[PDB]
Swiss-Prot record, chains A, B, C:
Keywords: Cell membrane, Cell wall biogenesis/degradation, Glycosyltransferase, Magnesium, Manganese, Membrane, Metal-binding, Transferase. Homotetramer. This is Galactofuranosyltransferase GlfT2. GO terms for biological process: capsule polysaccharide biosynthetic process; cell wall macromolecule biosynthetic process; cell wall organization; cell wall polysaccharide biosynthetic process; lipopolysaccharide biosynthetic process; mycolate cell wall layer assembly; UDP-D-galactose metabolic process. UDP-alpha-D-galactofuranose binds at residues 171, 200, 229, 256. It is found in: Cell membrane. The lineage of its organism: Bacteria, Bacillati, Actinomycetota, Actinomycetes, Mycobacteriales. It comes from Mycobacterium tuberculosis (strain ATCC 25618 / H37Rv).
Length: 628, 628, 628
């Protein structure tokens, strides 16, 4: 018992009372033939009826064996369940193809007075490519699973002193909640030493009514640091800065302020970090906050040849565990059993070892976007891999219709993408053509969609990149206001609350089906080009031709009109997109001029950016933008 | 009652407590409309709720009528169930198309005090092509099925004295368990007279802690015989040798050491043997140990025209009875109602009559593979057919991803295949071209997959075959070490624990979809041939181009690379396959030279092998390799 | 209450205790959401749980409205249910497309002490093309349906005195049972006045042990008449003969001896007959005895243009009410809502009014087959239509794999088909070419399948037809033995118990998939013709090339072989079909010669057959073959 608690890797957890049935599929998967639902008295125990089966082949309770095999020193894991009643524990593993293999099974008989203990040691040898381990319970009489867990065969190396960092910006209510959920589970609280909150917002988290109660439970492990708005980069950079200077914490764990939490997720990541073969970044997955049974992604990489972040080779976005169980014979579920290798983890949950952060230094001053990838790629170049752990997750806001890469962020995508590209493009010379051809495609689509402001702000992006690193650092704060100033000009960047704020449409909308037939995309594009050569009628800038819903607003519909309203992706307003031939060819020329500049000057940008990294990632340099 | 027990063919059995629901579909098939699961107090009884239906149209409890009709003297079978409660027994049969026919039905009323007995005599006449008989129970009040069985209308001929043979090699734990499960059911124990265990391993089954307890229950019906490693052939040959010389047992039942058991399976095979029209080999099916609701195969044959073991005409591998019930209108289930005729049964469970083994003599000294087929084909030539009984099964390890025919065994497949081919090729002359063309295909695929060691050891196989029978017998022990010595050379035959033991791959893996389009297999093969003509870059033998998962590693992916790691089929390690043009054309020439030798010298091999059979299958000759 | 019982059309009936769940779908259709199965205390009552729904949109309990509208004088029907508990009766109708229409609904509250009565009058007006009426029950508290029925709004015209006729031939056990099930329901017993059993068999129904008990319940309403074997024609002719001469029964109801019964079926047919607009034949459907949820057919017609009995225009054989409910949105179920018009009903249950049988006279002396159609077609020509009532059924043996039109019956099909054709071909002259072209197709298929005996006995059929009516009558008894004498010659007509009675096949059977591709049926037929021109190898008449299963034995497989065993359609034996070119061309010539004879002499056969009808259907003439 002394040694048990210090080798626990991940617990068997159940859902809270009154949790939606969709979300319960993350925890336990019950047979539709059982007479009654299973009951979860506490988050660690479960009551099962007589003559019933429940399967723990689930996102939260199954053991992601291949990952432990690959990155940790654990030769084998031990399942321990403590149960009363008569029944059977069946242990299964999978091959990386998803094929389920029955390992061993134990019949038990237990009473509340002499509770039955069931231990099974599963060797991690057969998980080179992938595979999970899990268990089912099948009952003779009624059964209570009092506790269950996956264990290593020796204590966890090192000490567990975690600096939790949570940068906040005008989301006090959410942040106060994140601080509240850290102290929920005693086993997390115990291993938290410091909690850094860089408050970059004008509506402060200290001012909240529920804060004192939340802050009291943390004691003086909590500090709040007021600084200017420096985005993600500045937020997390501050956390690193603090944890390395003002705490002696062995781990730095980046988190977001708008996250729901499964506290065992934190403990699982810590487990892997401590058991790692070599020092490494360890991150958690994100479940979708707005569709909570859905896993966002198993892991991301940066695709060379266009230098663009993307899904890892054998992983698809948005995996609904309620519709596609871990153990189903469907093709989406079969990919989950592969071991996914990432280039970086997102900063919703990402643990960085102390003397690794010290070595890599700070993040790049990118404001938002790409800061996290850069860090992953940088650590990789120093021999510190990143592992995105399955089964260890927080719930975060996804791009569940809500977001887009056409607004002000479109600047920060492109700009930072190039910055990071110069930083890590250790490859062939002629390769940069692939990224610029990549952008030309994007830029033609934008214009075809009448998203003019986007192109403009993207042309500022390429200008700002070409001015170098010294310049990027000085516009950490100034850049955001500058994007907005540019965007005010364009009717397509000015949100209006309703389309009824404008004169009713000339034409009622018609259902125009998505062309995915080769003959039809050829013709719909020809119509697009030719119309786009005619002089735009200005009557259509005063009265929109259509009231376009977000969903229906693609290249093929917008290339025929001169003016139309398009609903913002959140569905909170509309922009009045208005075609103009003169303004478009201008933007198109400026875009062409910048793309030619890029392939001409990229060799040069690699040299000057790589050289400037000790500065850009220095604590000393970040001091002059972080402290008043 | 005196006469009942001695005419019992197969009992109605239920699952153990806490058996997975998947596996219970082997026993009883319940209506999703029943209010509650059915309960199995004992392995022979079942409790059903009021207003409920359960169907015994299942692998274990249905009667494989066509088989009994074909091979046994039974004109009709009698169902006997003993039941309490009010309900109805409905008896069904099938045609060989799967079409279900209702035969008769009996309403019963029984109490525990005056239990109701229900007998139905089903005539076996209408089962020429195939068909099963089974029964359902449908309840008015709650019902208990106290016992149920299929009976012949007269006593079983002969006496039941079974020599059970279990050859073991370094699997003490498993073997001790097999000996334990034989004495489980009293009705099996009663008919076991001897249990021979040839222990060819250096980790002895006697040394096990649980052995004394297991051996005590057998008394002195158990002997253990220490001998050198002589593979399957030597193991089972020893069992035959012992049972014919040192026991007066009427039957010899071959078993494996790594098998879970349904004891009634043993009794069913014995039943058929005793009721046989003429003396015959009777075998049991294998269920998959690692996917326990799945039946491996209904029966195997040796396909003339390539002389290669294969699925019997109307049977497909891997039949999941949980997904495809015996009585479903699906195409996979419809094949189960045909009567499958085999050429041989596997030696997991195969019963050989005493004066049949005496007549046929020993097995061929093949070490592993084909020993069993040869025996089936040999018995066939003497007028002793083999029947693979459905419903009579043990659970055994299948090729559930775990195994492959590319490693050291690839020698023993080819070699023994040819040995056996010479032995039983009573057919046309020019026919041998079909086997050699068969091998040329295989050999080109191997090389294309960079599996060089395979070809090498297969070329030893053809050399060893051509040296004749006298020579094959002397290399019974020496051959295995010799294969390994040859395999050490090739990087593709040397297993390494992880791919991270090697330098990281040059390219990340890309999803390349299986080409089954005629235009695409033509082009993907053209790329294969042409690249395979270019000089291999040696930088790719020092740093692998890919980290290939087993599943993704086929001809079309491996024919483009010069070097890559491929994960072993168990998923326990990786080999570094490395292309070389010079070494390949060498192997290809040596393979071509041997194939030309075969068709030249096969007439000659038939003559010299057939002539040498009295020697190869002699007890006297096997003495000089079995006894120190 | 006085007037209720004499206007009852059909009762709401439930299944017996322990009836299979498949068959219960004929009676009531329960929601999978109900907490418990519904219970049927008695065959007329049903107990439903609280908060549950059951739908009586079922074969047995729904009202076939369109039929009642079309053929009876009933302007409207009345549903009456007597219920306790709180709940709601919902009444629905359908359009002939299957579209369900909600009519009205009644909330009830009843107690056992003051039981609630619910009456709904549904007008039959909107059922021109088809449509059903039914009701569902939906419960608040637990509900008991004590009784339910469909009623006319006035008493039944006429008196109900039914002569039940059951011809038996060597099936004593079955016949004794039919007599037992007539006296089961008191409401059937009451309306049965006589039961005629012509016993044409040598194993007499009187000799049975269970007969005296069965005969006692009938009193002296039962007579048994010994006569020679004169087949169906002679059996039923005898029943007519008796009921018209020796009873004063108002109805004659033909039945079979191998039928399970729903007694309300008898009452429903009687109901319609009594309520008929004009005098008419009224028949019941047949449910499949061996697949009891399956309806054989909604109704049959005689297809002019080939003069061949067939499914009525919008009806398909074999409708499984368990898989396709009356009220499902599937295409098979949608045809059930059309009103099917028949040309005749089968003699399993067919009611003939007294002064209609008197007018039409006896059946034709056809021995078996077509006797029933002829009678339907004859009655039609006199203005007496036939109606096949849905919901009124007996269970009878179908052609559920068991039967075929290639054996001795093949004579009686063709012969009688032509007899009947001459009798009723009131159409165009050149039309007979269509029947003879029809036969040429059949005859070429037979020969291609090596079914030589068939063609031979069919050529006797055409000879016997051409000899005229006077001759057909004299061979009523002699013809059956004569067919057998001819069949003894041919190896394909001699059944052997197993294929193992013959030398094992030269080739093992190969799976040859059904060609339904235009290119492939063209080639598979070309192979057929050309091989069929080569001289047959006689070694293949001594050792069969294959062991062909019934299912796999079609034109495309048999046209390539010279000799093979084919399993009888019951699966009880095999015939050795053996190709011969000399014997085949002979049969083919004799067939061609007869077909030329037919179209030459059909005008002549119409004249001589039609003229001979008063004789063939005379009671006086049938006397000389029915009485010793
Ligand atoms: O003007 C800004 C925009 C965002 N952020 C920070 O950048 C991170 C990511 O931004 P956001 O949450 O709005 O985008 P999301 O994560 O939802 O995609 C957050 O931690 C914010 O604190 C910031 O400091 N200032
Ligand atoms: O080096 C060996 C390899 C195997 N065997 C025997 O050969 C049989 C089949 O081998 P194995 O079980 O390893 O293969 P599998 O049956 O799983 O395919 C077993 O009964 C072993 O006892 C042996 O005696 N020596
Ligand atoms: O040799 C025969 C053959 C049959 N029948 C009668 O013909 C009818 C139909 O024959 P069967 O029942 O054998 O054929 P099925 O109705 O099953 O198709 C039955 O009522 C039999 O009594 C007969 O009298 N003598
Ligand atoms: Mn966020
Ligand atoms: Mn084995
Ligand atoms: Mn019949």
């Amino acid at each position: 018992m002394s040694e048990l608690a210090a080798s626990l890797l991940s617990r068997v957890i159940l859902p809270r009372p009154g949790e939606p049935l969709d979300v319960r599929k993350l925890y336990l998967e019950e047979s539709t033939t059982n007479a009654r639902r299973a009951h979860a008295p506490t988050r660690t125990s479960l009551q099962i009826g007589a003559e019933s089966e429940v399967s723990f082949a689930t996102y939260f309770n199954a053991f992601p064996a291949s990952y432990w095999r690959r990155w940790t020193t654990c030769k084998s894991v031990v399942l321990r369940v403590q149960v009363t009643g008569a029944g059977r524990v069946d242990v299964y593993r999978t091959k990386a193809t998803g094929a389920r293999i029955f390992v061993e099974g134990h019949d038990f008989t237990g009473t509340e007075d002499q509770p039955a203990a069931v231990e099974t040691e599963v060797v991690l040898q057969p998980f080179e490519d992938g595979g999970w381990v899990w268990f089912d319970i099948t009952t003779d009489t009624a059964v209570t699973l009092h506790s269950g867990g996956w264990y290593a065969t020796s204590p966890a190396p090192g000490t567990a002193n975690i600096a939790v960092g949570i940068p906040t910006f005008n989301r006090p209510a959410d942040c106060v909640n994140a601080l509240r959920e850290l102290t929920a589970d005693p086993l997390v609280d115990q291993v938290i030493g410091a909690v850094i909150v860089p408050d970059q917002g004008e509506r402060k988290v200290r001012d909240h009514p529920d804060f004192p109660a939340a802050a009291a439970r943390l004691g003086s492990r909590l500090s709040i640091h007021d600084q200017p708005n420096l985005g993600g980069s500045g937020g997390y950079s501050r956390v690193m800065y603090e944890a390395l200077k003002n705490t002696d914490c062995q781990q730095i764990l980046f988190m977001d302020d708008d996250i729901r939490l499964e506290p065992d997720s934190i403990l699982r990541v810590l487990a892997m970090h401590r058991f790692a073969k070599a020092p490494m970044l360890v991150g958690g997955q994100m479940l979708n906050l707005q569709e909570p049974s859905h896993l966002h992604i198993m892991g991301e990489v940066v695709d060379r040849s266009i230098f663009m972040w993307t899904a890892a080779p054998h992983a698809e976005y948005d995996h609904d565990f309620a519709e596609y169980p871990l153990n189903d014979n469907n093709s989406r579920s079969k990919l989950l059993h592969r071991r996914i290798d990432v280039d970086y983890n997102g900063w919703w949950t990402c643990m960085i070892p102390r003397q690794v952060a010290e070595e890599l230094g700070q993040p790049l001053p990118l404001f938002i976007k790409w800061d996290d990838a850069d860090y992953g790629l940088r650590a990789a170049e120093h021999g510190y891999p990143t592992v995105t752990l399955p089964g260890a997750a927080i719930w975060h806001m996804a791009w569940s219709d809500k977001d887009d890469a056409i607004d002000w962020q479109a600047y920060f995508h492109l700009r930072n993408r190039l910055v990071v590209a110069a930083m890590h493009w250790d490859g062939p010379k002629a390769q940069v053509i692939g990224l610029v051809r990549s952008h030309l495609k994007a830029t033609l689509k934008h214009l075809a969609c009448l998203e003019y402001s986007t192109v403009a702000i993207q042309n500022k992006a390429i200008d700002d990149f070409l001015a170098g690193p010294e310049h990027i650092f000085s516009i950490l704060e100034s850049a955001l206001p500058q994007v907005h100033r540019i965007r005010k000009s364009y009717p397509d960047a000015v949100v209006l609350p309703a389309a009824s704020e404008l004169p009713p449409p000339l034409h009622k909308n018609k259902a125009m089906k998505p062309p995915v037939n080769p003959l039809v995309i050829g013709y719909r594009l020809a119509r697009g080009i030719m119309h786009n050569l005619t002089a735009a009628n200005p009557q259509h800038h005063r009265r929109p031709e259509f009231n376009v819903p977000t969903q229906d607003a693609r290249w093929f519909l917008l290339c025929t009109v001169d003016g139309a309203t398009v609903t913002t992706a959140d569905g909170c307003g509309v922009v009045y997109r208005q075609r103009d031939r003169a303004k478009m060819f201008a933007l198109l020329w400026q875009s062409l001029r910048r793309q030619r500049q890029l392939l001409k000057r990229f060799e040069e940008m690699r040299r000057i950016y790589r050289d400037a990294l000790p500065t850009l990632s220095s604590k000393q340099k970040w001091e002059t933008a972080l402290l008043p």
